[PDB]
């Protein structure tokens, strides 16, 4: 998280930390329903050798864990619930080369206890428009290659899909309909390494509920000018998420 402020304890009860059994964090996630964690697809598989992606390239459920109700990055409190992993399902049309449909679902081995510090995030019932303020949270890298002690967050606007697809035209990197971009044109506030799968949420001012718009995916470095952080469009593959999870708002 580039140029962010520390989130207050209990304001992001849906964020999940995908970490090794060692404890070192490597990705983020979001609690959906009662036992599902949505995250980036590239978080749940190793680098391709046979450059094609196979099921054996995936990360074994007995090789990493998910922590809920977590506030610190390396410290612990009584709210942390360490949960194993049962199943991992990446998007069927996910492309590791173009990061297309960079989204996946993690079926928890043990369901967490829903309390004021652990509760799911809602699903988007419709598309999102330009200029919508969203909150992106994570424990990833900061400026000058640093890491925080608590959860970090930024509030950035959603960039127009046309201007973002044209923003990556110099780098010959396509931006598909399953990707959504955020961040200011001057740079600065952006996600970075370790924030993948992290939540990009906003508030339904009518229902008074926060819901997930996207998950951190990729981008050109972290916080560069004339560049926007790219996130997986949750509304695009919401039916695939609902078809696999079954949970609903």
């Amino acid at each position: 998280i580039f140029n962010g402020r520390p989130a207050q304890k209990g304001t992001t009860p849906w964020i999940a930390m995908l970490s090794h059994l060692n404890g070192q964090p490597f990705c983020g996630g979001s609690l959906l329903g009662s036992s599902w964690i949505v995250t980036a697809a590239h978080c749940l598989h190793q680098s391709l050798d046979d450059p094609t992606l196979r099921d054996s390239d995936l990360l074994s459920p007995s090789d990493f864990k998910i922590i809920l109700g977590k506030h610190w990055r390396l410290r612990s409190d009584e709210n942390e619930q360490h949960l194993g992993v049962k199943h991992t399902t990446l998007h069927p049309q996910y492309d590791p080369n173009t990061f297309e449909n960079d989204v996946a679902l993690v079926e928890l081995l043990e369901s967490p206890v829903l309390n004021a510090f652990v509760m799911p995030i809602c699903l988007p019932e419709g598309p999102q428009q330009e200029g919508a303020m969203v909150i992106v949270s994570g424990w990833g890298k900061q400026f000058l290659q640093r890491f925080p002690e608590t959860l970090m967050e930024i509030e950035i606007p959603i960039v127009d899909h046309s201007t973002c697809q044209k923003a990556y035209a110099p780098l010959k990197k396509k931006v598909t309909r399953d990707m959504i971009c955020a961040g200011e044109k001057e740079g600065g506030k952006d996600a970075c390494a370790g924030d993948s799968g992290g939540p990009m949420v906003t508030l339904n001012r009518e229902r008074g509920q926060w819901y997930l718009v996207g998950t951190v995916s990729w981008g050109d470095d972290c916080g560069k000018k004339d560049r926007y952080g790219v996130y997986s469009y949750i509304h695009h593959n919401k039916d695939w998420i609902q078809r696999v999870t079954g949970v609903r708002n």
Binding site: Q24, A40, C43, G140, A191, A193, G194, G198, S217, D221
Partner: peptide, 12 residues
């Protein structure tokens, strides 16, 4: 460059 936002980042 264009890198994944994970740890480690899948840079390119």
């Amino acid at each position: 460059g264009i890198c994944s936002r994970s740890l480690p980042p899948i840079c390119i």
